[PDB]
Amino acid sequence: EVETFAFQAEIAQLMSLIINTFYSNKEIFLRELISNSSDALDKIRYESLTDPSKLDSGKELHINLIPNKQDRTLTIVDTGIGMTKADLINNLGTIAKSGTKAFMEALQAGADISMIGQFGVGFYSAYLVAEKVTVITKHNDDEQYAWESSAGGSFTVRTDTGEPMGRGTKVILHLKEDQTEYLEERRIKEIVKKHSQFIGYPITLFVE
Amino acid sequence: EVETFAFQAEIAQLMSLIINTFYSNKEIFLRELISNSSDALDKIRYESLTDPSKLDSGKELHINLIPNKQDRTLTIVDTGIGMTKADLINNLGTIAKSGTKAFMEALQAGADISMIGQFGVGFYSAYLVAEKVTVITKHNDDEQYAWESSAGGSFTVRTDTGEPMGRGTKVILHLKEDQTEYLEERRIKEIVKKHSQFIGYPITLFVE
Ligand SMILES: Cc1n[nH]c(-c2ccco2)c1CCCCN(C)c1ncnc2nc[nH]c12
Ligand SMILES: Cc1n[nH]c(-c2ccco2)c1CCCCN(C)c1ncnc2nc[nH]c12
């Protein structure tokens, strides 16, 4: 069963801007996604201090970057807190509305797309390089879900039947045809070194 | 009743480094504290989406900066999630241990004190400008506490009998005698504009 949802108009507008604006410094998408993973790992680490059983779904706290040239995907995997169905459908869009509005206002005032992270919507920078984004996620209090959007104003959520994850999130970037450089080992290494070198979790770049 | 606690050796070492190192760009302390307030406000905002009664202790989400020349204090006030007694005594130091270690290693490798925020211990940058820091805090699930430390390897916690806060945190910086510029309106304005201009909560700088 796949459910289809409309983005609120503001988030749809943001996705369109991200897709439509001429902006060459696209590499910043990876810093934003890795930062998101780091925050999610901080969150589960913090919560387990008071309830250690929150780690029964997996003790290791890490980030994997997985390129696949055949699928043309770059997958950012974390074993963080994960997202509930309510996050995917309601909570996250509610928070995003005001960040979007502030980001938009900053842009007209001369701010730069690379500042998107300050407005809490850095995830959407994924659309600088991806035609479609699939998010597979599992939170302790909930089932494993697959969220997906190619923009165009809608997203889907379904219960995921793929490989069970234990706990955490995979962001699967289905790259635009002209953005395959982000599958290349030395390009990904370069970006992580430049933007993410102090992340406090091991980041493993898988080799193809 | 005042309880006195020893910092773990690593955090004590970090505080000493922050106090002892020659480093002129001290203004970064305010960005770190405002960023901390912002995160705490994000946290309560997020939690109230699923439990709106979490805001019964106060709906407004904001940050006040309050200079007092007579007391020689700069107070950063937020109406964020606040901190529990377990945070003050156990949880926060546990998380801080590994951030401290990474920060230390980054420094020897040539990183800069201004990067302290990437290691999740930016609060301690308060000691660049303050001889004593007092933290008054109230979390929904707990009583109002006062934490205090002048470094030297220990901190105290007591139940606070001052003005009840509703919910949130006040960081009261008892400034070093040579650091009173941070009580001056135009200096604080300058710093906020430079480092904190996109914080998604109203920041009110009180006038003396
Ligand atoms: C599916 C979705 N819907 N709306 C958003 C969103 C809203 C604002 C920014 O992103 C998203 C994406 C949310 C991404 C950031 N996040 C909240 C995350 N939470 C938990 N573990 C994560 N590991 C990577 N990121 C994670
Ligand atoms: C009292 C104490 N003990 N150990 C630490 C600490 C550990 C690592 C960084 O700071 C602190 C300070 C913690 C400061 C950051 N924080 C966790 C905060 N939590 C909730 N509302 C806040 N409003 C400002 N900040 C807030």
Curated annotation (Swiss-Prot), chains A, B:
Question: Subcellular localization, per the record?
Answer: Nucleus; Cytoplasm; Melanosome; Cell membrane
Reported modifications of this chain: ISGylated.
User: Region (Interaction with NR3C1) spans which residues?
Assistant: 1-208
Report the residues modified as N6-acetyllysine: K43, K69
What are the binding positions for ATP in this chain? N36, D78, K97, F123
Q: What does this gene product do?
A: Molecular chaperone that promotes the maturation, structural maintenance and proper regulation of specific target proteins involved for instance in cell cycle control and signal transduction. Undergoes a functional cycle that is linked to its ATPase activity which is essential for its chaperone activity. This cycle probably induces conformational changes in the client proteins, thereby causing their activation. Interacts dynamically with various co-chaperones that modulate its substrate recognition, ATPase cycle and chaperone function.
Its assembly, as annotated, is: Homodimer. Identified in NR3C1/GCR steroid receptor-chaperone complexes formed at least by NR3C1, HSP90AA1 and a variety of proteins containing TPR repeats such as FKBP4, FKBP5, PPID, PPP5C or STIP1. Forms a complex containing HSP90AA1, TSC1 and TSC2; TSC1 is required to recruit TCS2 to the complex. The closed form interacts (via the middle domain and TPR repeat-binding motif) with co-chaperone TSC1 (via C-terminus). Interacts with TOM34. Interacts with TERT; the interaction, together with PTGES3, is required for correct assembly and stabilization of the TERT holoenzyme complex.
- Please give the record's comment on domains: The TPR repeat-binding motif mediates interaction with TPR repeat-containing proteins like the co-chaperone STUB1.
Annotated family: Belongs to the heat shock protein 90 family.
**By what name is this protein known?**
Heat shock protein HSP 90-alpha
According to its UniProt entry, this protein's organism is Homo sapiens (Human)
User: Where in the full protein does the shown chain start and end, and how long is the full protein?
Assistant: 16 to 223 of 732
